[PDB]
Symmetry: D2
Subunit: 32 residues, 4 copies
């Protein structure tokens, strides 16, 4: 495993979390 390959997996997860956080924030406001 290259460290780059692990960093690239981590960057994918950060992208996932970005969108997930946006969706949660949006829904929290709709509940509000």
């Amino acid at each position: 495993m290259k460290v780059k390959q692990l960093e690239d997996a981590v960057e994918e997860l950060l992208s996932a979390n970005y969108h997930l956080e946006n969706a949660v924030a949006r829904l929290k406001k709709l509940v509000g």
Copy 2:
């Protein structure tokens, strides 16, 4: 309202597992 609350709860569960993976893989890096 109850449906949206349910969705939020599901997404907090998702966000938790996602961030566990991030934190621990960052430690591997």
Copy 3:
């Protein structure tokens, strides 16, 4: 080690499960 990678995969499978629950249900709401 490979165990740390496998643990992360397990976490992400749980993440996917819960995310897909929310998507399926929000799609029904949109209807």
Copy 4:
């Protein structure tokens, strides 16, 4: 506004795209 919900859904599908990518990346590395 229904667009609020549909935008949240779209964000979730974006999140799941990246999440699927991350899982596949890691599974490939598990099998090295």
